[PDB]
Give the backbone structure.
Amino acid sequence: GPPGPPGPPGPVGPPGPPGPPGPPG
Amino acid sequence: PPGPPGPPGPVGPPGPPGPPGPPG
Amino acid sequence: PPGPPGPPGPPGPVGPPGPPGPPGPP
């Protein structure tokens, strides 16, 4: 028999890094 | 007789950076 | 007998954006 179909998508990736600091007051 | 579905793929990549912080 | 399992699926969605940065200096 032929191979089965592809598996499901993997899970959602991790959050990105924080943004840079805000502007001086 | 087809095989079963494959395994789940890899975790996605890290998200993009957040926005700049608040003014001081 | 059956075939072998299929290949892995694709990678998942990109992760969410990070949080806002820290405050600026006073």
Remarks:
- Chain B is about 0% helix and 0% strand.
- The interface with chain C takes residues 1-24 of chain B (CB under 8 Å).
- The two ends of chain B are 66 Å apart (CA to CA).
- The CA atoms of residues 1 and 7 of chain B lie 18 Å apart.
